[PDB]
Structure formats: structure tokens, C-alpha cells
Assembly symmetry: C2
């Protein structure tokens, strides 16, 4: 089971699932082997009904698609559609938050409000929206209108790209025609250009894909901006993670998915419903998080994280998960089937994301509190049904310090330099105490033993004084293995990095260092890392492709993650990926994405399946950036 997951609570539940005959994601992976090599290499196309077409990576025919599409066209078209799909997820999430903010300030949904007014004003100023002498509700209405306007062509480009990156970076992207014109406009154009008998030039196709990945970045940044306005900007918090946060005697309710418009209300309402839970024989409602909507409420409220990504079924196998409340993205639909065994009530809430066999509750922001009460009451009913039954909650959890929004990081730094908060960080980059910065992002993937790449790479970088930040299920992997417990700084961190984490934490009234890894939030909160790196670039007067900053999507899976990796490259970052995407069937495409894209954006993908080798390559990329700044390394 150690070959399936490095997480000991997950291993325990894999043993329980096995002896109870519950098929898991790892079992379904085993039943898929050997997977199709044409698909694995990218050399397959089904974009018209003359297909399916395939191309042998080596040997004799077939060598070309029926319409004449070459290997490099087929591989680039498939990759572009993955980017467009990821953009569509992040921008659907952002669009739903824009409508929620608009409804809230139109009096249409009283459950929602402007919670962070400083953030609202700072966003309005960044967009050029006048604030002076304006009601907050009219400023927010204009911000919401600007958000929805970035989805279509207008007389400006997408502002959640052009106003969030350094001007030199915007200029470089504009010169290559990479600035998106509208978020859903770019998604549709990808789908058009990749359909049969359209774009058939690998370089042209991939340039389109880089532009669509920036539409994804805009969606991410919009999503973070809007969630902070509505629900509050995160600040440092303390909580726990892994299956042991479930409580046999409570109603255990998991919020799962990505959009917290729902889950944030669940958090609030569950508090009110406690006496109603106590009347059923429970201690109260224990809300726990799975995946990114779990990160959202962990970041803002300290809701403990139960599990993530590939291991999500394991929370149900405990037998103590009374309900799992779904919005959309990264939900294994298997949960609807597994629930018939474990008794969990699986509830979908979004019209475009239903699962056969799950109970659906039509959430509407206009009725959010009423919907949450109905949903929580199903969970209390479920708890009563397992009264007195035995559950197996692994007694395994870690301490998690999180909540490191970019604003929080800057505020924390401001305790060392009030008027120039970025300078203490750059000072320690220059003198070597901080070798560089690495963002860990993206998913787990059943192909990689769970968390193995994240932890192996992180340990090596932390020993080499790299400042490590993480989001999404990369934050999930590191949190479940103790990388967000400040008690582990001595074991994990090089002396230079330890000195810096200690100096900052002590100045922030803690007597102890910051944690070894800074948790920057959900998958859309990769935009927070952009904001920090962009602020560093502007403070240093250089573009992002000169900073000692890299990213690693060490175990990535989702089309969303493919989009994030692509815009990390497009904004100028060396970007390691730990599962090969379907590009190896075309050497020219692989060559563009791993080498020659350097000449366009300054970033590049680093393909490396072996995590020890990946860490070496990431250090080499960081150290080459140091050399380009004339720094020692």
C-alpha cells in the first residue's frame, strides 16, 4: 500500500477498503494497465468522424492522420484543448463568483456581502475604477462588471492579465501576440483552431495555447480577487490535517470541490445548527475540507483538511463521513457508488455538475442559508443512522499553519521593514540565506505514489535554503506530511532559510519560526504567488524571467493544472512537471515546450519523472537565475 500512497492514514484505509471489497482509484488504475501508448504519447486524434486516427511513434504506417494532420499538429491540437478546458474550469469558477458579488450588492442575496473593503478598493484602483466619493456597493458593482467584461472581446484586453503582471512582461507578451482578448473568446478560438481542417502549424498552434493559458491565469486571479472581497483575505491560521480530523462522535461534513460560494456558507450555518446536531446525539457539526474548496475554508477559517485529490475516497472508507457536499471539479464520480457501501450522503449542488446516484440540492445564492440547512439536516439524519456503529478513523493528523495570502506575507515581512516590506526578503536572496523560491502546485496523480514527488523534491530544496510556497493539492501533500508545522523547521530547513523563517516569525509575535512551507491557498490562489513574484520583480526592476523563482507541478493530473503549468512558463518561470503530458510523440513540440519557448517568454518546462533528479534540475534553474543577476550561488 506504500506503493500506492506515502500517506499512512491513506494506507490504513486502503487496507480497510481491500478487506471490505470496495474498489478504489488505485484498483481502477490497475485494471487499466497497460494504458494505450498512442494516447500516452499524444499520437491520437478524434476531432472528426473519419477518425479515430493514430500515428505510430516509430516504425511504419500509420504515419499521418487521414486528413493529413502530422504528429506535431495532432500533439499540439490535443494539448491546446487541454489548456482551453482548464481555462474553462478556472474561469467558470471566477464567473460564478462575479455573479455572486453582483447579486450581493444588488440586494438579491443577503447571505453575501463585501467582507474585505480594503481589497475591494485596491482591486478597483488596479483596474482604474474610481473610488473617491463612491458607495462601496457601486464600486463593487463596477468591479463585478469589469470581471464579467473580461470574458468577451471589448475595447481593452483582459485586464486580469494586463493589470496584474509587470509592464515589461506585458510588453514581451504583446509583442508575440499572446495577450488574451477575452476569456471565453480565447477558449472558443482554441476549440475552433484545433477542429479539423483549421490550424495546422505546431508553432502557431502552441502560441495560441500560451495565450489561452493567460486566459486561465486571468480566471485564477479573478477568482482569488472576488473570493477575498466576498469572504475575506486569508491571514495566518492554525489547524490540522489528514483523516484523524474526523470525529467519531460528531456529524462529519466534508466540503469538496473548488468554489466556496457554497462551502463558506456551510461553515457559517453549521455553527448555528450545532444544538440541532446535539439533539441527534452528536457533539455538533465537524466541517472538514477535501481538495480546493477545503483549502478555501482552511485558509479563511481554519477548517481542518481531511484529505485531497487521489485519496478522496479514503475519507468515506472510515465509515464516519456523514455527508460530502460537492460543487465541481476533481470529484471522483466513484464517490456516488462508494457511498452505497459506506453510508455517506453525497450531495451535489451545481446544475452543471451532477453525479448519477447522488442526491442533488439546487443551491442558489438567493437561498444559501436555507439550502445549507437542508443539506446539513440530511447529514444529521445520516449520523443518526450510524449511531453506535463502529468506525475506523486512523488516529493520524498533522499540525498545519496556513493562511499565507500575499497580503499576509507582505504584512509579516513589514515587521522587519515597515516602509519597504519586500526588501528583507530580497536582502536574504542576495546574501544567500534564501537561495530562491519554489511554488509547488497542482494535483496528485494515481501514476505517482501519492505525495512522493512533492515531499522528495521539497526536502532537498528546503535543505538548500529555497523558500517553498504551495497551493492546491501540492499544499495538501506537504501539509499532510508535516511541512506546515513550524516544529519541523529544525529538521527540514537549511540554516540560512531557518534563520529567515525564525526572524520573521519572531517579529510577528510567535516566539517561533514561520512553517517550513508557506501555504498560499487553493488552485486559483496560484494567482497569489503571481502577485508576490510580480511584486518582487517590480521592486527589483526586472522581469519575472530574471528572478530565482521556479515552479513544480510535481504530480499533476487535471486539465486545470496543464493550463497553470503553461501560464507559469508563459509568464517566464522554469516549470518542472512530474508526469509526462501527451507530447512525447512529437519531438518538435517537446523541443518547443522544453527549450525554444525560452526565446519567447523566458520560461520553459522541465520534464523530469525522477524527483531526486527534478530537485537537482530545479536547483540548477534557480542557480542559473542567480548567476544572471550576478549573485553567488
Amino acid at each position: 500500500q506504500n506503493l500506492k500512497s506515502t500517506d499512512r492514514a491513506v494506507q490504513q484505509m486502503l487496507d480497510k477498503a481491500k478487506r471490505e471489497g470496495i474498489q478504489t482509484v488505485w484498483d481502477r488504475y490497475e485494471a487499466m494497465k497497460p494504458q494505450c501508448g498512442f494516447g500516452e504519447t499524444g499520437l491520437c486524434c478524434r476531432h472528426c468522424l473519419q477518425g479515430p486516427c493514430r500515428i505510430n511513434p516509430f516504425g511504419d504506417e500509420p504515419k499521418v492522420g487521414i486528413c493529413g494532420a502530422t504528429a506535431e499538429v495532432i500533439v499540439a491540437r490535443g494539448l491546446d484543448r487541454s489548456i482551453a478546458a482548464g481555462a474553462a474550469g478556472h474561469s467558470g469558477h471566477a464567473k460564478h463568483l462575479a455573479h455572486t458579488l453582483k447579486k450581493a450588492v444588488q440586494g438579491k442575496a443577503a447571505s453575501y456581502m463585501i467582507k474585505d473593503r480594503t481589497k475591494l478598493h485596491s482591486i478597483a484602483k488596479r483596474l482604474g475604477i474610481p473610488t473617491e466619493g463612491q458607495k462601496d456597493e457601486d464600486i463593487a458593482l463596477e468591479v463585478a462588471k469589469a470581471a464579467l467584461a473580461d470574458f468577451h472581446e471589448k475595447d481593452t484586453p483582459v485586464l486580469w492579465v494586463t493589470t496584474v503582471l509587470p509592464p515589461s512582461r506585458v510588453k514581451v507578451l504583446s509583442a508575440h501576440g499572446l495577450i488574451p482578448a477575452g476569456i471565453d473568446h480565447e477558449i472558443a478560438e482554441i476549440m475552433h483552431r484545433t477542429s479539423m481542417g483549421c490550424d495546422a502549424d505546431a508553432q502557431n498552434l502552441l502560441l495560441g495555447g500560451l495565450r489561452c493559458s493567460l486566459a486561465d491565469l486571468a480566471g485564477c486571479y479573478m477568482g482569488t480577487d472576488l473570493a477575498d472581497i466576498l469572504f475575506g483575505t486569508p491571514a495566518p491560521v492554525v489547524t490540522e490535517s489528514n483523516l484523524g480530523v474526523l470525529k467519531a462522535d460528531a456529524v462529519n461534513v466534508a466540503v469538496h470541490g473548488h468554489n466556496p460560494v457554497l462551502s463558506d456558507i456551510i461553515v457559517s450555518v453549521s455553527k448555528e445548527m450545532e444544538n440541532e446536531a446535539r439533539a441527534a446525539g452528536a457533539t455538533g457539526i465537524n466541517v472538514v475540507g477535501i481538495c480546493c474548496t477545503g483549502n478555501e475554508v482552511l485558509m479563511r477559517h481554519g477548517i481542518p483538511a481531511c484529505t485531497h485529490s487521489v485519496s478522496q475516497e479514503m475519507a468515506m472508507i472510515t465509515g464516519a463521513l456523514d455527508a460530502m457536499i460537492l460543487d465541481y471539479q476533481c470529484i471522483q464520480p466513484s464517490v456516488a457508488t462508494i457511498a452505497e457501501c459506506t453510508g455517506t450522503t453525497v450531495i451535489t449542488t451545481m446544475e452543471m455538475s451532477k453525479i448519477t446516484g447522488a442526491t442533488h440540492v439546487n443551491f442558489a445564492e438567493e437561498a444559501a442559508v436555507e439550502n445549507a440547512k437542508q443539506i446539513l439536516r440530511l447529514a444529521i439524519d445520516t449520523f443518526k443512522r450510524r449511531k453506535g456503529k463502529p468506525v475506523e478513523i486512523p488516529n493520524i493528523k498533522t499540525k498545519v499553519v496556513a493562511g499565507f495570502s500575499t497580503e499576509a506575507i507582505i504584512n509579516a515581512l513589514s515587521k522587519l521593514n515597515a516602509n519597504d516590506p519586500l526588501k528583507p526578503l530580497i536582502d536574504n536572496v542576495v546574501n544567500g540565506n534564501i537561495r530562491g523560491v519554489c511554488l509547488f502546485a497542482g494535483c496528485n496523480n494515481v501514476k505517482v505514489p501519492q505525495d512522493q514527488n512533492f515531499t522528495t523534491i521539497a526536502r532537498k530544496l528546503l535543505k538548500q535554503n529555497v523558500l517553498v510556497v504551495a497551493t492546491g493539492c501540492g499544499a495538501g501533500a506537504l501539509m499532510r506530511h508535516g511541512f506546515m508545522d513550524p516544529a519541523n523547521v529544525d529538521e527540514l530547513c537549511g540554516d540560512g532559510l531557518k534563520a529567515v523563517l525564525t526572524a520573521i516569525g519572531e517579529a510577528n509575535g510567535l516566539g517561533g519560526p514561520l512553517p517550513p512551507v508557506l501555504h498560499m491557498g487553493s488552485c486559483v490562489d496560484n494567482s497569489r504567488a503571481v502577485a508576490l513574484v510580480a511584486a518582487l520583480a517590480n521592486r527589483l526592476g526586472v522581469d519575472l524571467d530574471r528572478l530565482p523563482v521556479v515552479a513544480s507541478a510535481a504530480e499533476w493530473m487535471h486539465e486545470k493544472a496543464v493550463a497553470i503549468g503553461t501560464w507559469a512558463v508563459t509568464i517566464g518561470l522554469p516549470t518542472h512537471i512530474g508526469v509526462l503530458p501527451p507530447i512525447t510523440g512529437s519531438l518538435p513540440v517537446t523541443q518547443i515546450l522544453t527549450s525554444s519557448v525560452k526565446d519567447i517568454t523566458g520560461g520553459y518546462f522541465i520534464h523530469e519523472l525522477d524527483p531526486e533528479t527534478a530537485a537537482d534540475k530545479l536547483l540548477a534553474a534557480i542557480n542559473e537565475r542567480r548567476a544572471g543577476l550576478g549573485l553567488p550561488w
Copy 2:
């Protein structure tokens, strides 16, 4: 070669290609066999990097996707993405025409203008745009603004759906939540809901797909509306078709693709350039059409159609094709490679549609005339290079009467009844002279011997007094086999249908019948068939699903065609398809699309690979509609 194409000019060029060693689309198809069965059945998914996943149609594992996606979810998700891609093509085409109209009436591109002012005003009234006392350029500016607004969410739904269908049909679709909210909005939502861990309910997924197909219908109807304003509404015209329209002694220039913003200018400018062509030793510029941009200029100007779809490479094999001017969609990228053998100059013109090895000329509407001159001058240079060389143009062509826009059809009918032009058609439906109406639409497909399904089905329906209309490459197949020559009415048409075609043609100053098949234009001009059928429904006071009207995509290929077939079903039409889409791996999905969708929209797919059986099934569907109206059959 008869097994590859039923077209005798194509067979001749297949023999030439074979003895010259030029690989064709049929050769590349042969090199693909046996094609992958998982892809053919729909039972394959690559929507995340844990894939590729497949499901055995029968037998043992794999039985389910790694994430838990079932056969019915995987099949519905793949189909939804095909619909979204088709919508993206038709709506990209429409969007480009909306920007062209906007530029033209802003003084930004003098090559373009309001050519059809009656159409502009009728569209403005249908949209509710005030015309009274307004400059034409301001009315058109408002129409163009309304077109671009339908691409995104706003306070109205997509008007190019809700204002073009009968109100009872709109009410039925609204009740099932099928009315699109915005064209690119629906495309993005499909891409989101079909990404991993999102929508996992076949019925929910397919309902989303029906709504996205209506976004495609809107794109088609917008494209037709805008092209008619800019370039003129078609009226009856006479021309020729097939390879024999090439002329050994002329500069032969093929316009190929879909959007005529380019090709319409080429037609105009080539006339001016004739003396410059004569100076090179040619008789002048012989502009000919391939695919839908060929249909556009055939419809408006009588440009002869050279070939279509699967056989497009054959025009080059003659050795007389001096240039082929491309915009986007359905262009086999093989043409760039074949041109190195045949000497043809292949020129791309659109930024998002390039082909490696082809010359690119950056067309802009602001510079349309200058660009066309540069492009035509490359063609004249190419003609000079083959001076005195021998070419092989098959001496094969047909007479084509075309130009049957819905306005033209109504005007033609108005000669039998001035104040009630639809009534003579309905009269002959009621008395049996016209059994029903069949629209032939969509592509050729290398899997089907070229044109075999279209002609076999058409002959049987015409013998049974069905009024047959056609668009796109269905019009192309019927035109190349003489179905648009009125001289063939005696041979082809039942006595009732012949009487009606004769009565109409004679009243329109022709001494002869209308042609056996009415050519209604390009693929986007399927919207014209909608307008006619909607007018018939409104005149009869019934919904479309009560009319004796069916469609047949007899040899379909493109994602665009999948979208068209799906909205034909969604607006209430029995819709035959002659190549199986990847749905047979899921019986529940097949059952929805062929039977139970009847209960939602009244339309349904008719899957039938055998064209003789298909014609029987189409007649049965028509006759069941007749019975529901209490008509004899």
C-alpha cells in the same frame, strides 16, 4: 476507384495520383485500418493525465475510468466536446463577420459596405432594434453590436436563438433549460462540465450538449444574416460544377474554406486584374470554389464549384490549379504537401489557421483589396511557371441552378400567391403533391464512398415526391451528380413533385421547372432552412416537431456537422445520420439520442448506415408526421 468516389472526375484524378505516386486521403485512410475500436465506440477518455482510459465494450476489465467515470459519462462527455468545437467554428465565423460589419460602418474598411439594406432592416426589426429615422450605418452598428453581445451573458438570452424560432418552440426549450445564455459562454461551460471530476450524469451532460448545439444554431444564423447584409442575399443563379470548370488556359484560383469576407473580395478584384492576367499569357482569372466558401460565392455570384470536402486534393492533381486561397475549416492540411508535387500555390490568410509549408498572407479587412491583389499576383506568377505544360482536367461538369435563399424561395412562391406565398407550398403538402421536406446537410467522409449516401437517398425521396433542399457538401454532392439541373426533373422527380416544381418555375419566367434539388447555400446557411421551416410552422400554427420535415447528414465528418445534427434534433426534426458517431459504446446514451430525446424536443437521431434503409426510415418519419396532421400518406 469507384469504391473511393462515385464522382467520375474524382475517379480520373485518383488514377493520375496513383500513377504519379501522390498519396491521397483515401490512401491515408487505408494506412489507418483497422481503426481503434475504443475510439470508434466512444469508450476512450483523455481528459486528464491519469489517462488514457478506455472501457471494453464487452467482456472483462477495464470496465470504468480510473476516476470512476462510467461508459455513459465518458461517451456523453466526448460528444459534448464535439458539439462545443462545432459551435466554436460556426460562431468564430459569425464573430469575424460581425467585426467586419462594425469596421465597415465605422469607416475603417471601405472594401466592405451594406449591400442588402432590406435585409439589414428586417434583421433589426426582428431583434427589436429601432430603424425609424435612423441612418443605415447606425442601424448596422446596432445590429453588429447585438451580434457580438450574443457571445456572452447579458440580460437577454441569445437572440439569434429566441427571435428565430417559433414562440412555442422557444417555450418548449426554455422549460427544459435549453436556451443558451451566451455563445462562447455555453462553449466554455461544456469544456468545464466535461473536464475531469465535474458533470457525471449522462442525461445532465446531454441536456448541456443540446443547449450548446443551439449556440451553434445561433452562430449559423448570425453568419448567414451578416454575410447577406455585407455581400447580398442570394437569388437564383446558373453556373457549373466539378473539375471540368477549370480551364487550362486561365489562371485557375480556388477559394477554399468557409468565411467569404476574403473570397468575396477575391471575386471582385480578380475581374479588375484580368488584363494583368492576359499579359502573362492567360485568358484571365478563373475563380472557382471548393467547400463552403465556394458555395458562398456560387450562391451570390455564380462562381462555378470545382469540388468539395473529401475530394479537395483532386483539384490540385489536375496540374492546372495555380493557387488555392484558404481561410479556415475543412482544409485537408495535406494540400500544403501535395502542392510541392502539383505546383499549386497554397496561401493561408487567417492568423489562427496556418499550414506548415504554405505561404501566408496576412489578410486584413482594412487592406482587403491590396491583399487580394498580392494574392492574385502570386497566382499569376504560378500560371507563368506552367506555361506550355500539359494538364489533365477531366472534361466532366454539370449544370447547377442555385441561389435558393429563403427569401428567394418565398419570392418564387409569391408568383403563385402574392399575399400568402407559403400557402401554395402547404396546399401541395396537404394534397400529396409534396410528401414532405428533406434537408441534406453536412460533409463527405472517407468511410463512405463519396456521394453514395446523398445520391441514393435523394433519388428515392424525389421519386416519392419529397421536396429536397441541400446545403454545404450535401449540396456539393447533389450538384456534382446533376441534381441541380432542371433538365433532370423528368428522370428524377415523382409526378406530384414535378408538377409543383414546373408550376413554380414557369410562373418565375423560365419555361421550365425549378431544379430537382434546391441549393440553400453553405453550412451556416442551414440557418436558411430553419427560417423556411419556422415560417411554415408559424403559417400552420404548429411547432416544428409536427411538420413533415426531416434532415439527413448522410456522410457527415466535422465537429461542425455534429453540432448541426444535434440542433436539428433539438429544434424538433427527425435527423438521419449516415456515419456512426462515437456513441455505440453506451446503450443508455444511444437510447437517449435515438429515442427518448423525442419526449424532450420531439426530434430524434435516425442512425442508419445503409442508404436504401435510411431513405425508407426518412419516408416513414415524414409519413408519421403526415399522419399526426391527419393527412393522407
